[PDB]
């Protein structure tokens, strides 16, 4: 129950707070996703056993699944549940495609079922310290779009579209469920335009902004790290991962986004400076965990545009940063 999410997408779906029935269904389906990627004769027997396990939990725990959904969302939840069982992209259809041994219909139904699982979990999640009572806070998820502009000489090269782009744009999903203070502060800065024009730098395995000394408040933002299997984040306290533990939002994911530490203390984040983490499992310690795992306030993951992070160079700028989803769930103060 403590593996390193291969992608920001998997990190984010595992981080959705949901009830144990959904987490068991989710993990069963995510196992199959992995199995489908193995260069071997497809293990359709193992796949079928896993989906049968997911279906049994989904049928047996129907009442618990819907009970965890708030009253006003139970109709939406009931419709998602029906799809999860009997929809064309649902669990019964998945067992059928596995029996047929058509790997591309299995892959499609698996993606559909995992999407429905995530939406059900988000419905449940929407139902879930005094010193920070008036701090900016993000409830739930946000999406921040960051456009990076290259120096007049240099160029981005995507697989799509253009081997000589002056600018490229990435999307970061930030997770207020697991990092409400850090994501909240980030969202406030983005919405105020504070990152528009900020310089970027490459230092070791990180793309880090200039420090915004002045030009914003110098608020005290405590370190914020939620150990997985616990139900509140720790504040001002790094998480030791030497004996099997892992944060709900691990740093050890390519394109993870975290705040730098404050200028005076490892117990606090910078009010402004953040970085993309260019995780490389070659440079890692025990269990492939970054040597910095559990030590920084991770608050989101780069999803769209992941592949241009490694092309950013010192002197590139954040042309603009904008909170394109979730601003209704940002509380100020």
Short mmCIF file of C-alpha atoms in Angstrom, two decimals:
data_model
loop_
_atom_site.label_atom_id
_atom_site.label_comp_id
_atom_site.label_asym_id
_atom_site.label_seq_id
_atom_site.Cartn_x
_atom_site.Cartn_y
_atom_site.Cartn_z
CA UNK A 1 0.00 0.00 0.00
CA UNK A 2 3.10 2.26 -0.34
CA UNK A 3 4.47 2.33 -3.91
CA UNK A 4 5.78 5.34 -5.84
CA UNK A 5 3.11 6.64 -8.25
CA UNK A 6 4.63 6.41 -11.72
CA UNK A 7 2.88 9.56 -12.93
CA UNK A 8 1.39 12.78 -11.64
CA UNK A 9 -1.97 11.41 -12.81
CA UNK A 10 -1.62 8.31 -10.60
CA UNK A 11 -0.35 10.41 -7.71
CA UNK A 12 -3.40 12.66 -7.95
CA UNK A 13 -5.94 9.83 -8.21
CA UNK A 14 -4.41 8.03 -5.23
CA UNK A 15 -4.53 11.28 -3.27
CA UNK A 16 -8.31 11.76 -3.65
CA UNK A 17 -9.83 11.25 -0.17
CA UNK A 18 -12.42 8.52 -0.56
CA UNK A 19 -13.83 5.61 1.37
CA UNK A 20 -12.03 2.23 1.50
CA UNK A 21 -14.43 0.52 -0.96
CA UNK A 22 -13.49 2.98 -3.71
CA UNK A 23 -9.79 2.77 -2.89
CA UNK A 24 -9.89 -1.01 -3.23
CA UNK A 25 -11.71 -0.83 -6.58
CA UNK A 26 -9.27 1.86 -7.74
CA UNK A 27 -6.17 -0.14 -6.77
CA UNK A 28 -7.50 -3.27 -8.46
CA UNK A 29 -7.98 -1.38 -11.73
CA UNK A 30 -4.65 0.43 -11.49
CA UNK A 31 -2.93 -2.96 -11.08
CA UNK A 32 -4.38 -4.03 -14.44
CA UNK A 33 -3.20 -0.81 -16.07
CA UNK A 34 0.33 -1.79 -15.00
CA UNK A 35 -0.14 -5.40 -16.14
CA UNK A 36 -1.19 -4.20 -19.59
CA UNK A 37 2.15 -2.36 -19.92
CA UNK A 38 4.29 -5.45 -19.28
CA UNK A 39 5.93 -6.72 -22.50
CA UNK A 40 4.64 -10.25 -22.00
CA UNK A 41 1.78 -12.41 -23.17
CA UNK A 42 -1.12 -10.51 -21.65
CA UNK A 43 -2.00 -12.12 -18.28
CA UNK A 44 -5.74 -12.18 -18.92
CA UNK A 45 -6.36 -14.63 -16.07
CA UNK A 46 -4.81 -12.28 -13.53
CA UNK A 47 -6.67 -9.37 -15.10
CA UNK A 48 -10.00 -11.17 -14.83
CA UNK A 49 -9.42 -12.00 -11.15
CA UNK A 50 -8.66 -8.36 -10.36
CA UNK A 51 -11.81 -7.03 -12.05
CA UNK A 52 -13.96 -9.68 -10.38
CA UNK A 53 -12.53 -8.44 -7.08
CA UNK A 54 -13.40 -4.85 -8.01
CA UNK A 55 -16.92 -5.80 -9.12
CA UNK A 56 -17.60 -7.77 -5.92
CA UNK A 57 -16.56 -4.81 -3.78
CA UNK A 58 -18.59 -2.45 -5.98
CA UNK A 59 -21.71 -4.61 -5.71
CA UNK A 60 -21.31 -5.56 -2.04
CA UNK A 61 -20.40 -2.07 -0.81
CA UNK A 62 -23.00 -0.16 -2.85
CA UNK A 63 -24.61 1.33 0.27
CA UNK A 64 -21.28 2.39 1.81
CA UNK A 65 -20.12 3.90 -1.50
CA UNK A 66 -23.22 6.08 -1.85
CA UNK A 67 -23.45 6.77 1.90
CA UNK A 68 -20.11 8.63 1.72
CA UNK A 69 -21.54 11.02 -0.92
CA UNK A 70 -23.21 14.23 0.34
CA UNK A 71 -27.00 14.39 0.14
CA UNK A 72 -27.12 16.96 -2.65
CA UNK A 73 -24.80 14.83 -4.81
CA UNK A 74 -26.34 11.40 -4.24
CA UNK A 75 -28.31 11.48 -7.49
CA UNK A 76 -25.14 12.29 -9.41
CA UNK A 77 -23.39 9.58 -7.40
CA UNK A 78 -26.13 7.05 -8.10
CA UNK A 79 -25.72 7.65 -11.85
CA UNK A 80 -21.95 7.25 -11.68
CA UNK A 81 -22.42 3.99 -9.77
CA UNK A 82 -24.77 2.60 -12.42
CA UNK A 83 -22.20 3.45 -15.08
CA UNK A 84 -19.46 1.79 -13.02
CA UNK A 85 -21.40 -1.49 -13.05
CA UNK A 86 -23.44 -1.63 -16.26
CA UNK A 87 -22.06 1.11 -18.51
CA UNK A 88 -20.23 0.42 -21.75
CA UNK A 89 -17.06 1.54 -20.00
CA UNK A 90 -17.91 -0.24 -16.77
CA UNK A 91 -16.74 -3.24 -14.79
CA UNK A 92 -19.06 -5.82 -16.40
CA UNK A 93 -18.00 -4.62 -19.84
CA UNK A 94 -14.36 -4.84 -18.70
CA UNK A 95 -14.70 -8.49 -17.65
CA UNK A 96 -16.27 -9.12 -21.08
CA UNK A 97 -13.38 -7.50 -22.96
CA UNK A 98 -10.88 -9.42 -20.81
CA UNK A 99 -12.68 -12.66 -21.69
CA UNK A 100 -12.45 -11.63 -25.36
CA UNK A 101 -8.69 -10.98 -24.99
CA UNK A 102 -8.90 -7.79 -27.04
CA UNK A 103 -6.19 -5.65 -25.38
CA UNK A 104 -7.28 -2.34 -26.89
CA UNK A 105 -10.88 -2.71 -25.76
CA UNK A 106 -9.54 -3.71 -22.32
CA UNK A 107 -7.34 -0.61 -22.23
CA UNK A 108 -10.30 1.58 -23.26
CA UNK A 109 -12.71 0.11 -20.72
CA UNK A 110 -10.04 0.37 -18.03
CA UNK A 111 -9.57 4.09 -18.70
CA UNK A 112 -13.35 4.60 -18.72
CA UNK A 113 -13.81 2.70 -15.44
CA UNK A 114 -10.95 4.57 -13.75
CA UNK A 115 -12.49 7.89 -14.83
CA UNK A 116 -15.81 6.88 -13.27
CA UNK A 117 -13.99 5.70 -10.15
CA UNK A 118 -12.23 9.07 -9.85
CA UNK A 119 -15.47 11.02 -10.26
CA UNK A 120 -17.16 8.93 -7.56
CA UNK A 121 -14.19 9.53 -5.28
CA UNK A 122 -14.37 13.27 -5.93
CA UNK A 123 -18.04 13.25 -4.91
CA UNK A 124 -17.07 11.56 -1.63
CA UNK A 125 -14.08 13.87 -1.18
CA UNK A 126 -16.35 16.90 -1.47
CA UNK A 127 -17.65 15.82 1.95
CA UNK A 128 -14.12 15.88 3.42
CA UNK A 129 -4.69 23.89 13.16
CA UNK A 130 -6.14 26.93 14.85
CA UNK A 131 -3.07 29.09 14.19
CA UNK A 132 -3.86 29.12 10.45
CA UNK A 133 -7.60 29.77 10.67
CA UNK A 134 -7.40 32.88 8.48
CA UNK A 135 -4.85 31.58 5.96
CA UNK A 136 -5.77 31.30 2.27
CA UNK A 137 -6.96 27.76 1.61
CA UNK A 138 -7.97 25.72 -1.43
CA UNK A 139 -10.76 23.21 -1.00
CA UNK A 140 -10.41 20.40 -3.50
CA UNK A 141 -8.54 20.56 -6.77
CA UNK A 142 -7.41 23.43 -8.95
CA UNK A 143 -5.78 23.70 -12.34
CA UNK A 144 -3.09 26.29 -12.99
CA UNK A 145 -1.97 26.99 -16.56
CA UNK A 146 1.60 28.26 -16.88
CA UNK A 147 2.90 29.70 -20.14
CA UNK A 148 6.71 29.71 -20.35
CA UNK A 149 8.45 31.98 -22.87
CA UNK A 150 11.95 31.26 -24.13
CA UNK A 151 14.78 33.72 -24.67
CA UNK A 152 14.84 35.25 -28.14
CA UNK A 153 17.55 32.84 -29.29
CA UNK A 154 16.39 29.47 -27.94
CA UNK A 155 13.44 27.27 -28.76
CA UNK A 156 11.00 24.67 -27.45
CA UNK A 157 10.46 21.48 -29.46
CA UNK A 158 7.29 19.46 -28.89
CA UNK A 159 6.16 16.31 -30.64
CA UNK A 160 3.07 18.44 -31.39
CA UNK A 161 3.19 21.02 -32.65
CA UNK A 162 6.30 22.86 -33.73
CA UNK A 163 10.00 22.13 -33.34
CA UNK A 164 10.68 25.83 -32.79
CA UNK A 165 8.11 27.29 -30.39
CA UNK A 166 8.87 30.55 -28.62
CA UNK A 167 6.49 29.56 -25.83
CA UNK A 168 5.00 26.42 -24.34
CA UNK A 169 2.24 25.93 -21.80
CA UNK A 170 1.88 23.34 -19.02
CA UNK A 171 -1.01 22.49 -16.71
CA UNK A 172 -0.48 21.87 -13.00
CA UNK A 173 -3.24 20.28 -10.95
CA UNK A 174 -2.91 21.46 -7.35
CA UNK A 175 -4.32 19.43 -4.50
CA UNK A 176 -6.11 21.36 -1.77
CA UNK A 177 -7.37 18.09 -0.27
CA UNK A 178 -3.84 17.17 0.86
CA UNK A 179 -2.13 20.59 0.91
CA UNK A 180 -4.90 23.13 1.61
CA UNK A 181 -2.61 25.90 2.89
CA UNK A 182 0.15 25.50 0.30
CA UNK A 183 -2.21 25.14 -2.65
CA UNK A 184 -4.30 27.99 -1.28
CA UNK A 185 -1.32 30.33 -1.06
CA UNK A 186 -0.14 29.32 -4.54
CA UNK A 187 -3.63 29.86 -5.98
CA UNK A 188 -3.85 33.31 -4.39
CA UNK A 189 -0.48 34.31 -5.86
CA UNK A 190 -1.41 33.00 -9.32
CA UNK A 191 -4.77 34.80 -9.34
CA UNK A 192 -3.11 38.07 -8.29
CA UNK A 193 -0.69 37.82 -11.25
CA UNK A 194 2.35 37.59 -8.98
CA UNK A 195 4.07 35.00 -11.17
CA UNK A 196 3.54 36.87 -14.45
CA UNK A 197 7.05 37.69 -15.62
CA UNK A 198 8.90 35.58 -13.04
CA UNK A 199 12.29 34.25 -14.04
CA UNK A 200 13.06 30.55 -14.05
CA UNK A 201 16.31 28.76 -13.18
CA UNK A 202 17.66 25.24 -13.48
CA UNK A 203 19.45 23.98 -10.38
CA UNK A 204 20.21 20.25 -9.96
CA UNK A 205 16.94 18.39 -10.78
CA UNK A 206 14.64 21.38 -10.49
CA UNK A 207 13.17 24.27 -12.42
CA UNK A 208 12.85 26.93 -9.73
CA UNK A 209 11.40 30.42 -9.87
CA UNK A 210 13.21 33.52 -8.78
CA UNK A 211 12.55 34.23 -5.12
CA UNK A 212 9.88 36.89 -4.84
CA UNK A 213 11.60 38.91 -2.12
CA UNK A 214 9.22 41.81 -1.82
CA UNK A 215 6.53 42.30 -4.48
CA UNK A 216 4.40 40.03 -2.24
CA UNK A 217 3.69 39.73 1.47
CA UNK A 218 6.27 37.82 3.48
CA UNK A 219 3.69 35.54 5.10
CA UNK A 220 4.75 32.60 7.28
CA UNK A 221 3.68 29.47 5.36
CA UNK A 222 4.36 26.33 7.46
CA UNK A 223 5.73 23.17 5.90
CA UNK A 224 2.74 21.03 4.97
CA UNK A 225 3.18 17.28 4.39
CA UNK A 226 0.45 14.64 4.83
CA UNK A 227 1.80 11.14 5.54
CA UNK A 228 -0.20 8.52 3.69
CA UNK A 229 -2.41 6.46 5.96
CA UNK A 230 -2.98 9.42 8.27
CA UNK A 231 -5.93 11.78 7.93
CA UNK A 232 -4.46 15.27 8.64
CA UNK A 233 -1.34 16.97 7.25
CA UNK A 234 1.63 17.63 9.52
CA UNK A 235 2.69 21.27 9.84
CA UNK A 236 6.24 22.60 10.25
CA UNK A 237 7.38 18.95 10.33
CA UNK A 238 9.17 17.01 7.56
CA UNK A 239 8.15 13.41 6.97
CA UNK A 240 10.81 10.75 7.46
CA UNK A 241 10.60 8.08 4.74
CA UNK A 242 13.44 5.89 6.01
CA UNK A 243 11.15 3.11 7.31
CA UNK A 244 8.43 2.66 4.70
CA UNK A 245 6.41 5.87 4.95
CA UNK A 246 5.36 8.05 2.02
CA UNK A 247 3.57 11.40 1.76
CA UNK A 248 0.13 11.51 0.18
CA UNK A 249 1.67 13.97 -2.28
CA UNK A 250 5.14 12.48 -2.91
CA UNK A 251 7.92 14.55 -4.40
CA UNK A 252 9.27 11.48 -6.19
CA UNK A 253 7.19 11.99 -9.35
CA UNK A 254 8.36 13.61 -12.56
CA UNK A 255 6.83 17.09 -12.74
CA UNK A 256 5.85 17.30 -9.07
CA UNK A 257 5.48 20.92 -7.93
CA UNK A 258 6.58 22.03 -4.45
CA UNK A 259 7.41 25.25 -2.62
CA UNK A 260 11.00 26.03 -1.82
CA UNK A 261 11.85 26.40 1.86
CA UNK A 262 11.69 29.82 3.52
CA UNK A 263 14.91 31.80 3.61
CA UNK A 264 15.32 31.30 7.38
CA UNK A 265 13.87 27.87 8.10
CA UNK A 266 13.29 24.36 6.77
CA UNK A 267 10.01 24.33 8.71
CA UNK A 268 8.42 26.92 6.45
CA UNK A 269 7.96 27.38 2.73
CA UNK A 270 8.94 30.44 0.79
CA UNK A 271 5.88 32.71 0.46
CA UNK A 272 6.60 32.80 -3.29
CA UNK A 273 9.33 30.56 -4.71
CA UNK A 274 8.27 27.17 -6.10
CA UNK A 275 9.86 24.54 -8.35
CA UNK A 276 9.07 21.74 -10.75
CA UNK A 277 10.89 18.58 -9.67
CA UNK A 278 12.49 16.65 -12.54
CA UNK A 279 12.46 13.38 -10.64
CA UNK A 280 14.89 10.76 -11.94
CA UNK A 281 14.72 7.34 -10.30
CA UNK A 282 18.42 6.93 -11.08
CA UNK A 283 19.22 9.76 -8.64
CA UNK A 284 17.25 8.37 -5.73
CA UNK A 285 17.72 6.56 -2.47
CA UNK A 286 16.03 3.64 -0.77
CA UNK A 287 12.88 2.59 -2.60
CA UNK A 288 13.53 5.00 -5.47
CA UNK A 289 12.42 7.86 -3.21
CA UNK A 290 14.07 11.21 -3.81
CA UNK A 291 16.60 12.13 -1.14
CA UNK A 292 14.33 15.14 -0.61
CA UNK A 293 11.15 13.07 -0.20
CA UNK A 294 8.93 14.24 2.63
CA UNK A 295 11.00 17.40 3.12
CA UNK A 296 9.21 19.98 0.91
CA UNK A 297 5.56 21.03 0.68
CA UNK A 298 4.50 19.32 -2.55
CA UNK A 299 1.20 20.81 -3.70
CA UNK A 300 0.50 19.60 -7.24
CA UNK A 301 1.66 17.75 -10.34
CA UNK A 302 2.33 18.83 -13.91
CA UNK A 303 -0.09 16.93 -16.12
CA UNK A 304 -0.39 18.41 -19.61
CA UNK A 305 2.91 19.62 -21.07
CA UNK A 306 5.11 17.40 -18.85
CA UNK A 307 7.55 16.80 -21.68
CA UNK A 308 8.74 20.39 -22.12
CA UNK A 309 9.82 20.79 -18.46
CA UNK A 310 13.22 19.30 -19.28
CA UNK A 311 13.79 21.95 -21.97
CA UNK A 312 13.37 24.99 -19.69
CA UNK A 313 16.61 26.95 -19.29
CA UNK A 314 17.78 29.67 -16.93
CA UNK A 315 16.44 33.02 -18.12
CA UNK A 316 13.19 31.62 -19.50
CA UNK A 317 10.20 33.31 -17.90
CA UNK A 318 6.71 32.46 -16.71
CA UNK A 319 4.87 34.63 -19.24
CA UNK A 320 1.57 34.15 -17.41
CA UNK A 321 0.06 31.94 -14.72
CA UNK A 322 -3.68 31.54 -14.40
CA UNK A 323 -6.03 29.53 -12.23
CA UNK A 324 -8.36 28.19 -14.91
CA UNK A 325 -10.24 25.81 -12.61
CA UNK A 326 -11.08 25.92 -8.92
CA UNK A 327 -11.18 29.63 -8.11
CA UNK A 328 -14.67 29.15 -6.64
CA UNK A 329 -13.06 26.91 -4.00
CA UNK A 330 -10.30 29.34 -2.98
CA UNK A 331 -11.04 31.05 0.34
CA UNK A 332 -9.50 34.46 1.06
CA UNK A 333 -8.68 34.98 3.84
#
